[PDB]
Design a protein around this ligand. Sequence first.
Ligand SMILES: C[C@@H](Oc1cc(C(=O)N(C)C)ccc1Nc1nc(O[C@H]2CC[C@@](C)(O)CC2)c2c(Cl)c[nH]c2n1)C(F)(F)F
Length: 254
Amino acid sequence: NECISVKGRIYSILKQIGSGGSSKVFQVLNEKKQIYAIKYVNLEEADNQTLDSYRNEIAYLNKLQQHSDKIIRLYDYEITDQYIYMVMECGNIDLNSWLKKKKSIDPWERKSYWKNMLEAVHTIHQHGIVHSDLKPANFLIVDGMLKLIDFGIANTVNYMPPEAIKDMSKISPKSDVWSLGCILYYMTYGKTPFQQIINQISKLHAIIDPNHEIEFPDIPEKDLQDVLKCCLKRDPKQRISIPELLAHPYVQIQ
Ligand SMILES: C[C@@H](Oc1cc(C(=O)N(C)C)ccc1Nc1nc(O[C@H]2CC[C@@](C)(O)CC2)c2c(Cl)c[nH]c2n1)C(F)(F)F
């Protein structure tokens, strides 16, 4: 029972979640027998651009607590020149890990998760943030509710949007839409739109190639087909927005 003190409360480390070096995440038990995830960042070897990115992310996380429960809760934290400890709610599992296991998903589960994803991502767009790099590992399943863990601020090409390829000034909220689209698309067809494309240079070229038509096979839910098609238009101006997705039949009508 290795221990950690945060703002005067003692946690018992149960185990580590994943690996990582510079940051580590741990499952812990407090005095009230409640589980929490504690993120540990070692700052010993970190420059100022890096520090400032960490500090900005903690600010947005702490600020957006009050605006949506589809952002992971942050109960407390400690920050010193040497380290950061952040006491968060524990998710069951990350969306990525889960998708790799699961064969099919209940359609109601899919829909419910989708709305969670939109509620989260909309909340960050409302505060001027665009993630730019959304993937399934950015979401954590907590009691059958998806919650967003990272804002992309702090320091697989399959979910990467055309705008972000054309850059490497042009990343807007529409870019996050493409990425959520990609994630929904796996959730409906078992693969991202370009998994089958082998080389990385080939994927990147297919994401931006107007002549590369994305397969949408027909499915019972014709509305879902339409959301996938709208998220995944190559021109951001043509591409559906999040406020529009929240008003879409897929989300609104059973
Ligand atoms: C309850 C279960 O929690 C998680 C398990 C798993 C799992 O099965 N993996 C990673 C294969 C994933 C997540 C669990 N919960 C989990 N994981 C987190 O961070 C993982 C760190 C490692 C990764 C790879 O960046 C994925 C996020 C956090 C954070 Cl920050 C806050 N709350 C969290 N809850 C535990 F491991 F604690 F038993």
